[PDB]
Amino acid sequence: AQNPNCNIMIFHPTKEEFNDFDKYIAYMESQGAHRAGLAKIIPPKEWKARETYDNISEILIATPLQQVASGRAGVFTQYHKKKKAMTVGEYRHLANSKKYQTPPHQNFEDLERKYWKNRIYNSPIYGADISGSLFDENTKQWNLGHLGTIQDLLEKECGVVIEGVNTPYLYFGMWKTTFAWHTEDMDLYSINYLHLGEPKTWYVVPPEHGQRLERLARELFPGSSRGCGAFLRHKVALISPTVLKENGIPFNRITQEAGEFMVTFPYGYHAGFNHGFNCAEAINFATPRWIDYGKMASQCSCGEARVTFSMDAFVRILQPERYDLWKRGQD
Ligand SMILES: O=C(O)CNC(=O)C(=O)O
Ligand SMILES: [Mg+2]
Ligand code: NI
Ligand SMILES: [Zn+2]
């Protein structure tokens, strides 16, 4: 078995290897990459996502989210308070302000220490989940707006034609903006490209150990667990590396820099934080190997998780027994 310790693997495809996206994902899996839950892909030196980032300031962040924490430094939840609209240029100025800017630090490990010590005492503002793309239309390789759709994959594997669409999302971050512990909708893959700015640190639990993280989370968030049998679908709970180590949960960490892709694999729990002003693009995708994960994915039916239009068909076809309860949660 390849990669039996479930380490995060880093790949350096050549320009020739960068042509066929599906084939390269399958290659990475042949080397055991998926066992970690997360992989990094450094694009060939010849590749670029677009020519420059000099003209993005007028993108609108219609609903910036202030991420307010509750709990203790290593075990906390966050809620999202909606703020007034602002442009990307206005958000960048805010990120760079004395109130929100990255503090002085020695290296990524020192900044990580400071994050976990101090995150809860601040409320950073995240421009998350903005439909759109920064890839040039002429970028033919690893263009996250031109990937094969999940609906087409389901139809190719299973024969059933379904409604729905699959488009990318932009994320504008600042110091301490936080992504809570989660797997993707329907335990899909994700791919994330860091277009510009400061890094993003990731934590990940191997898919084969995801239930260990779930059991810890039920212990640490006992009211939330009574409320919902899949409350990590709410995407609000944080647990630090120190607390994971104290509880014997297997995990890994890695820092993504501008110009790099990360892939999350089915049922790979992940969480993380941004180092400073940045912009990322991400989308969900599927492969043949996903189908079995999609059939077994947990679901939130309490009403909190509320998701896209296109998840309806995935539940309806892959999980017909669960469909009626889940749809009630949507309505
Ligand atoms: O970058 C972020 O805030 C969160 N991204 C992801 O969870 C992802 O790409 O799967
Ligand atoms: Mg613009
Ligand atoms: Ni994710
Ligand atoms: Zn729920």
Distance separating alpha carbons of residues 145 and 130, to the nearest angstrom: 13
Q: Is 300 annotated as a binding residue?
A: yes
Q: How many helices (H) and strands (E) does the chain have?
A: 10, 16
In contact, 286 and 186? CB cutoff 8 Å = no
What residues make up the domain containing 205?
Answer: 1-331
User: Per residue, what are the HEC states of 226-281?
Assistant: HHCCCHHHHCCEEECHHHHHHCCCCCEEEEECCCCEEEECCCCEEEEEECCCEEEE
Query: Which residue type is seen at 122?
Result: N
| Experimental method reported for this structure | X-ray
Q: Put the strands of the sheet holding 269-274 in their side by side order.
A: 178-182, 269-274, 200-205, 252-256
**Resolution to 1 decimal place, in Å:** 1.1
In contact, 74 and 239? CB cutoff 8 Å = yes
Question: At a CB cut-off of 8 Å and minimum separation 6, what does 116 contact?
Answer: 73, 74, 240, 241, 242
Ligand 1 pocket, mutate which of 174, 176, 192, 285 (most atoms under 8 A from CB): 192
How far CA 199 is from CA of 16, 74, 196, 203, in Å, comes to 27, 21, 9, 13
Residues in the chain: 331
Q: Which of 110, 141, 128 is nearest to 43 (CA)?
A: 141
CATH number at residue 313: 2.60.120.650
Distance separating alpha carbons of residues 308 and 222, to the nearest angstrom: 28
Q: Is 118 annotated as a binding residue?
A: no
In contact, 6 and 35? CB cutoff 8 Å = yes
Number of domains in the chain: 1
Cβ(8) to ligand 1 under 6 A? Answer: no
Neighbours of 285 (CB within 10 A): 21
Distance separating alpha carbons of residues 67 and 56, to the nearest angstrom: 24
Cβ(239) to ligand 1 under 6 A? Answer: no
Phi/psi at 74 (5° precision): -100, -5
Q: Is 91 annotated as a binding residue?
A: no
Question: At a CB cut-off of 8 Å and minimum separation 6, what does 275 contact?
Answer: 102, 108, 111, 175, 198, 199, 200, 201
